């Protein structure tokens, strides 16, 4: 696994930005750190925590759906509505369809269908105004590795290294990628920007983004520490 490697890379990137005290500059020039080409390929656009019974269902921005079940397995339904991928507790991956699957997955496929319907009828799509980055052969559709909720946010850890943090109080969100070394920030008003983290060090940023990057570092440390 490059999972621990990617989390450490992210802690590197966040520590350096946070150590530079970026909201504490004389003149902050946040816009100089923007790079629209660093926007993620994938992020979580909807989610429903039904972990008291089944697990966590979610939709990614490409309209694929997934569930992280309480037994730590994952089922993904691609946006063709037909292909599935199953990921076991130990990460072993297998491929199936709605018409070709082992009997052992029938309940979990049905659960995914109920989650899919719930999300479609009730939940707003986060990032609906964002065009995702073009995918290429080096990237694969990710699954939800793990998640947790604090009093102030839900933290979502994807299998491509990305970490997403949705804040409950004001609906602001961060998408962190340790390969781009970038953070996408969605503010309360649904405006979005993607910044190269090294450049936020140089140019600074507002107290709002600085505060959420401090919180992000603590959450990533929390993810690594449980691993």
């Amino acid at each position: 696994e490059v999972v621990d490697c990617h989390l450490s890379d992210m802690l590197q990137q966040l520590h350096s930005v946070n150590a530079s005290k970026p909201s504490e500059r004389g003149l902050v020039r946040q816009e100089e750190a923007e790079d629209p080409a660093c926007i993620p390929i994938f992020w979580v656009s909807k989610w429903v925590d039904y972990s008291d019974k089944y697990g966590l269902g979610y939709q990614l921005c490409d309209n694929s759906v997934g569930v992280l079940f309480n037994d730590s397995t994952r089922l993904i339904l691609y946006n063709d509505g037909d292909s599935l991928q199953y990921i076991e507790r130990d990460g072993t991956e297998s491929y199936l369809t709605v018409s070709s699957h082992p009997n052992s997955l029938m309940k979990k496929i049905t659960l995914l269908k109920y989650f899919r319907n719930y999300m479609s009828e009730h939940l707003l799509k986060a990032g609906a105004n964002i065009t995702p980055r073009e995918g290429d052969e080096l990237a694969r559709l990710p699954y939800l590795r793990t998640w947790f909720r604090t009093r102030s946010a839900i933290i979502l850890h994807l299998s491509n290294g990305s970490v997403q943090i949705n804040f409950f109080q004001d609906h602001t969100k961060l998408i962190l990628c340790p390969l781009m070394a970038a953070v996408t920030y969605i503010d309360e008003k649904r405006d979005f920007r993607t910044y190269r983290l090294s450049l936020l060090e140089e140019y600074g940023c507002c107290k709002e983004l600085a505060s959420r990057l401090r919180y992000a570092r603590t959450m990533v440390d929390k993810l690594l520490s449980s691993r």
């Binding site: 989610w47 429903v48 925590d49 008291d52 009730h122 939940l123 707003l124 986060a126 839900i154 609906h171």
Partner: peptide, 8 residues
């Protein structure tokens, strides 16, 4: 109960 992201 159940918790979820931002509703329509």
């Amino acid at each position: 109960n159940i918790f979820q992201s931002t509703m329509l």
